[model samples]
Every structure is written in C-alpha cells, then in structure tokens.
Target: FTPEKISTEIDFGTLSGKAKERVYLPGRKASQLDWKYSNAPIVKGAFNWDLLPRVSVGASGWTTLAGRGGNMVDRDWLDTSNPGTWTDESKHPNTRLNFANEFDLNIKGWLLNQPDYQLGLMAGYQENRYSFTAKGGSYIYSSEGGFRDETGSFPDGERAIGYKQHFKMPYIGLTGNYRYDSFEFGGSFKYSGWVKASDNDEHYNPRITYRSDVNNQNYYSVSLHAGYYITPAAKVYVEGTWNRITKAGIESYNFMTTAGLKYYF
Candidate 1:
C-alpha cells in the first residue's frame, strides 16, 4: 500500500527594526516554507508449474516506498518556524516513485530424475527512483528558550533559498527451487547497488555527497508448504517462507504463515 500528502504550517514572531527593515525592503520576503515528495508502494504476484517434463517458468514483482515522520520540507528556509516569509517561483516540485520486476525459469532431470523431486533456475531485475524540492519561506519566533542561531535562527545576511535531490537503484539475481509431493523449497543470489545526488544552489550552502555499497554477491533462502486431502474434492494447506535481503548493508529475514481450504472443480 502507498500513502502521500502535501502539508503546511505557519507561526508568528516579533523582530527588531533591522530585521523589520530587511523584511520591508524585499519585494516578497518569506520567513519560512517547506515541501517534499514521498515514495509510493507497489505489490505483485507470481506462480510456477512443472507440468512440462523438465522445464518450468514463473514471474513476480514486489516494490514499495515507506517511511515514518521526518522533516518533509524541500527548502530549508521555509522549513523553519518564524513570523516573516518569502516565496520562490523557480523551485521544482517535490515527488518520488519506485519500480521493480522479476522473471525466472528452471530445468530438472538434467543429470538424473530422483523420484518425486524437481530442480530449476531463475533470473530477475529491480529499480527505484526518488526526487524532492523546496521553496518560499515564512517565519514566526519564540520567547521562552533563547534561540540558538545555528538550529533556530536564519542567517545574518541575505541567503539563497532552494533544495533538490535525486536517487536511484537497480539490481539483478539468479535463483533455484525444489519440490516433492506437497512440500517446496527455494533460494537466490543477487547483486545490487544505489546512488544519490543533491543540489547545492541554496543560501544555507547544503553539502552534496555520493556513496555505494556492494550487496551480497550471492544469497540463498528456503520455504515449506504442506496440504492434506479432506475429501475427494476438498483440501487444506499451510505455507511459510524466508529470505536474506541484500543491498541493505545488513542481513534481514522475515517469515509468514497462513492456512486455507481449496475446492477442486
């Protein structure tokens, strides 16, 4: 599932004559402003069959964008809370999106057919993209805690105002699986990487950098499933699976369990 939003908040404050004079001199000065684009969610399904003597094919896709609360503002100036404000018309929109896809094929009995057993091979691809932007500024002030100039106050002199970022990732992999009666198991090895880019065209002078981490060149997983015939035309089954995700710089695993009944036509 995917979620998205465009939100805004305003605050008011008092400034000395010098601050007021600067605010008045500007054609359209702003105290604070912020904007951002979050990632979207994507879901997919796949199935494979070994009906052919020794060949089988299957496909699936699963990609999603998810995050918790964080500063969503594109421009840093607008992200602050003060009484005065300015707006920029040259800023780009804040937005992000992700995409992924997978495909596989397998061949069994290449060497010898062990009864009630089958083996196969697989391959697939994945990609993701993210973009963001910020503009304008409106300001409000505080009286309680003395404002720390670095974290809570705007710069002393005129400053540029705009923020933008771009990021992308792509990957590929190989897989294998085996099945017997009502039970099945599988695993895969993959290579993946990512890149990030940011614009330094702002008054605050933001920093820009790029870093890439090599994913596990190879990884494997296993799964299990079982079914019982309750009647000539009815059956009950349970399934569970797990995998070691790569490109994340850490090893992670997840498993799910489910039960259901099926009726044959």
Candidate 2:
C-alpha cells in the first residue's frame, strides 16, 4: 500500500498535548482581567459512532495534567454599568494556573458526505473548569473618584489569593472535515445561549471572600485542527481554539493551542 493513500475513518482515539492558554475578562474596561497559562499538559479522548449513513454521535474529553504557570491583572469598579468608577486595580506578576479542563458530548448529522469531505450540524453539551492561584501582587485603591490613592505590594511566593470558575453549556454548532492523502483537517464553530457559570473568588483575607455565585452567560467558540497520519492507526495533530463567554457586565475570553499524537482504534 502507498503511504499517500491512507484511511480517515476512525472509531476512537487517545490524545495528549501541551496547551498554552490565556483567559481574559474585560468588564467595560472598568473591572478587567488577563490570565495566562503556559505549557500546560492536556490529555484527551475522542470517539465517534456513525449510527446511520448521515447521522453520528461524538464525544470528547480534555483533562489537565498537573498544570502550572499563571499571571494576571485584576481590576474592579464600584459600578460596572452607568457612571462606572474604578475602585481598585491589582497586578499579579506572580501566579499559578492550578488546572483547566473540558468535556464535550455531541450528535451531528451530515449535510454533505463524500469520500474526501463531510459537513454537519452538531448539538452538544460542554463543561469546563479553570482554577488559579495568586502568589503575590501589587495593588492600588481609590474611593468615589477621590484624589487620594492607596498603593501596596504583597511578598512573592505567598499564596494570597485563589479563584475558580466553571461553565456548563448546551451548544449548537456546525462541523466539517476534509482529507487529502495522508492529511486531514477539521473545524467547528459553536454558540450557546444557555450557558450557566459559577465562580468563587478567595482573597484569603478575613471577611473577604466571594461565595459561589451563579449567572447566566452566552458562549461561543471556534476550533481548528489539522493532522497527518503516520501509521494505519496513529496520527499527529495540532489544534487551536478561541472561546468567549459573556453576561451583562462581564466577559471572559480564552485562547488555546494544542499539539499532540493520537492513536486510533
């Protein structure tokens, strides 16, 4: 058999990679944040079942592997809406990304299925979790547009803050795939109007912690992937994803890139 004439059909695969990610929250420029994670290990599993010639179900999971590295900027406003006032701003130059992971379950039907390409409509559920730690940072505080400003810094290597957020989304999307010889590529775009998000913020100061709170948010994501088959059941792949979730007063954005090897069964 020629190496250029390879197969694209798959049942399931296991993938592992390192991801570089950034999560940002821009709150009307009043209360904003920029969080970064570098070289975080991620493990994944994906499977597909073609129940009919034109219908299929797919599921995937991504898990973190003792992830690390985080630095962020946090800002707050007395009012994030009309007449917004910047009440506080903090720069976290030393931080740690504790974890980040996601799971997705979807069913899709092919609109066009050919030997070299396929496109479909997909609907699914996705859940994601992110946690962070702030070791040390500098802060500036003001009150009611006052001229007086308070400034201070925290010592490095001291665990002074912790934050976590979770998102549950039910999404509708479009997905497509194409293959040429030993190469394959695919992409997906998803939008979720029913996105539930829960968050907790711990400043680690007495009487100063945000209890778990839930909010309704809208989310959208786009992912692109490319792969090259190295053997009958093995391939090397890379993926890039951009995601955003927003509510009335705040928005979160995540950008990630992953490279890995996948073994199919």
Candidate 3:
C-alpha cells in the first residue's frame, strides 16, 4: 500500500527579467501548469502471497510516464541583439521516468507456544531509468537587453542536452512479531545498497546542467505496526515508517493510523 503523500518534493529556481519575461511574463506566462504538466504519471504495484503456514513471499514493480513534471529555472538571460531576445523562445521542459521492483519473504512462529514470536528475511532487485531535455533559446549578456545578467553575452541561440542512467540495488532484512490473543505487534529492520548507472547525464537539471554523472547513494530504514481485533470479524490498525534515501538525498520518518472493519467469508 502507498501513503497519501508520496514523499516527493519539487523546487524551481528564480525566473525574472528576459528569462522571466520570455517564459512567464506574458499572456503565455509560465505558471504552475508549465511545471505540473512536465511530469510523467507514476505507476506502482505489489503482489503478496502466503507460501507456507507461517511463511510468505511477494514481488512489486513501479514505473512513471514520460514528460513527467519537475523543477525548471529561468536563470541565464539572453543578449539584447539575440534573435530570440524579445521573442518568446524559452521552452526548456524537463521530464523523468523511473522503474523499480523488489522481492521479499517472511516467516512467523515461536520457539515454543509463547506470547512472543519472530523470524523473516527479505531480498530484492531494483532498476531505475531516467532522462531529460532542455531546448529553445540561448545564453546572452544581461547588459545587452538580455534577461537576468549574472554573466555577459549570448553564448548561443538555442541548446538542447539529454542524458540517461540505470542502477541496481540488493537488500536484506529481519522482522519480529508478538501476539496477545486478539492483538498483534511487529517491527522490522532493513539495509540496502545501489550500483551506479553508466548513463547518468540522461536526466535533466535546470539547476545544474552540463554534469553527466551523479554520485551513487545508499540507505536504510526501520518500521513498526500493530493491529487490534474489535470483534470476531472487525479490526483496526496503525503503522509508522522511517527511511533514508541515497541519490535523491532525503531522510524522513512518519506515523500513520487507520481504523476499518473487515468481514470474512
């Protein structure tokens, strides 16, 4: 299951002067729509099954559509005499797509018929694909009637850059569960690592262009969950999760509570 908030954030840099005027200053301004429409549709799914009396195994996969929304900034200004200066040529759209999958197995039982029980392991394979594009307009001097002038002169009239990257990750984990009649409790620990992709530049970077490769990252996490049986056919549950991401660079922890009724056939 997925959380209501996907835990992803997008940040766009400054947009003023020529770059601003050309991209977002006119009747055809660059509003939130410009950025929102750039992102692709995200897809994710999971499969779980009980392999044995107290053992289970599952697999999952996820992918995103092309032209997905992302961050883009109008930083460098164009020169005055630049052919596309007064003209609206700012159309550097950024897009990204990623795919990932994993496998896991779990076992549950007690050394004896005690109140406490435990035992489970998880391993997985993950793959990611990404790409980006920056087209239209060129770099120019700020003093020459160009947009924002941090530097000077239009370097070119139009430019386009693209790159791609792939990576793999392996993971293992352990879990423990305790039971008290109609109530159950559990917790888990996991560790994961990744292999750097060769084509890292395929991804777009409105903030940092020209860089072809990105540094590889690693992460780990821990989580807990509980459930209570209100009646023979009804139950309520809650869970808390925390994780550390690698390349994207994010560390987060959150708690979630849910109450619902279930009926068995």
Candidate 4:
C-alpha cells in the first residue's frame, strides 16, 4: 500500500563518440574477464548458558567457506572534481574478497512474558574481520620498475606488488527479541567505537602515507520467523534478515534476505 512519483531528469549533451583501445588506462583495452560470484555455505550456532535463572550467556558465530572476490568501481568515490575516477578496477587479472567469520556473545533473559508471547533483552560484543584487498597486476606499474618514474607508483617488476587492507574491530550493541507460540521475531542495533581502528587509502603503503584509524561503524538488523515443533525436542524455522548498515567504518549498504531451518533441543 503505497503511492508516489519522484522521478529524476538529468541530460548532459554527453556527445556519443566511439573510441576504442583504452587510452587512459595505459594497458587496458576493450576486454572481458570471468565475473564470478560464490558464497559458500555458512554455519551459525548459539548456545545458551543459564548462568542465573533469568539470565543466560550465549555464543554464536557465522562463517562461509568461500569468500574471495572484488568489484570494479569508480575511483575517488567522494570527489567529484574529475570526469570519472576510471577507478573502474574491473578486468583485473586477479581479485580477492574477504569472507567473514563473525562471532557474538550476549546476555539474554525472558524479562517480559505472558502466557503466549515472550520478550527479552540482550547486550553483547561482536568482531568483524575487515578483509578487503585488490590489485591491478595486469595494469599495476610495480612490475615495470622504470615505469615507477612514469606513473610514480612502482615498477612493472613489482606487478605482484602486495596490497594489505584490513580492520579487526570489536563492537558492542543492544538486541531484543519476542516469541509467540511457534513464531519468534527480533532485531538489533550496534556501533563500533572506543576501540582499535585502522584505515588505508591509495597509499596502501603500510603506515607511511595511509589514512589513519577511522572506526565508527554501526549495524542494524531485523528478523521475523516461524518454527514448527516437529519433534517435541527439535523445531525447524524459516527466517529472513533485512539490515541497513550505517556508513561508519568499513561496511557497505547491503540488502539481504535469508531463510533457514532450526533444531529446538
């Protein structure tokens, strides 16, 4: 149930000209490389440790077996002073992405409950393995040492020039959940701060010209689900998560929906 009409209209006399043989990118030409997408199966589990009658401690972690990929995007994303960043990092010979293994710990309780619905509160910490790296070995100048003076980057010899960019942040967030009959739903909001931080830009050159620590990350996630009490001691569930992450430290705006089964033992 919605109604709206907010369209956009922008016309730049962008003259249509035809020119091939990527001139700006030096070695790059009209080409195509394998575009691959793989998200290996992930495992997630949580254990409830009843420390007190009403309080419990829980530990959970999620990970994927295959997590390595990169994207070709415009460069100087924040600066509009150039016609285009051409930063398009596509067609690179090889790119590696980071698959994450996030672990969380929380203290939960059935603080509010009735005969049918139950509500609880939790606060915990989470670790995000910020692993994002890329390389343009095909176009990288590190290989041609002489080119170092040409592009001032490196030599072609160092085409295999190493690039390291990562962030291991410890964050704290608040969470809550509700249960009614065989249906359960919950959501959480978290932020990373007052913790260790790291940042790197063009000068992925270690600590030299790289950007300093810039960590102010935040996460927001919500979920709704229903489970069937198949076997008294076990239950299966189908759930989905819709999240909106703030532009804080090292995360992108992602839209995702996930479904899974559960065992209630």
Q: Please, what is the whole-model Cα lDDT of each candidate in the order they appear?
A: 0.31, 0.69, 0.38, 0.40
lDDT of 2 by residue, 89-135 (tens): 77887777787778888988789878689999989999988887776
Show how many residue pairs clash in every candidate, following the order shown: 25, 0, 18, 16
Model 2 accuracy (lDDT, Cα): 0.69
Of candidate 1, the 10-residue stretch with the lowest lDDT total is 13-22
Cα lDDT over the full model 4: 0.40
- The runs of at least 3 residues in candidate 4 whose Cα sits more than 4 Å from the true structure, single-residue gaps closed, are 1-40, 51-53, 68-70, 77-94, 133-181, 185-211, 215-217, 242-249, 254-261
* Candidate 2 lDDT trough over 10 residues, lowest sum: 14-23
Q: Which of the numbered candidates is closest to the native, going by highest lDDT?
A: 2
RMSD list, candidates in order = 16.8, 6.3, 12.9, 14.3
lDDT (Cα, tens digit) per residue for candidate 3, span 1-265: 2222111111111111010111233233232112112223433344444434444455544344224433333432233345333322233433222222223333323223343555566555544444434443333224434344534323333344443334444556666677778887887666666534334232223333323233455646576867677765554555443444344321111121222233221
> Quick one: how many clashes does candidate 3 have?
18
Error of 2 at 124 (Å): 0.8
> Candidate 3 local accuracy as lDDT?
0.38
Candidate scoring better on TM-score of 1 and 3:
3
Which prediction has more favorable TM-score, 2 or 4? 2
TM-score of 2: 0.77
Model 1: per-residue Cα lDDT over 133-245, one tens digit each: 22323233323444322233233333233322222223344444455444444444444433222222233333332222333333333445565656645546554434334
The residue ranges of model 2 lying beyond 4 angstroms of the native Cα positions read 1-30, 78-87, 142-149, 155-159, 211-216
| C-alpha TM-scores of all predictions | 0.33, 0.77, 0.43, 0.57
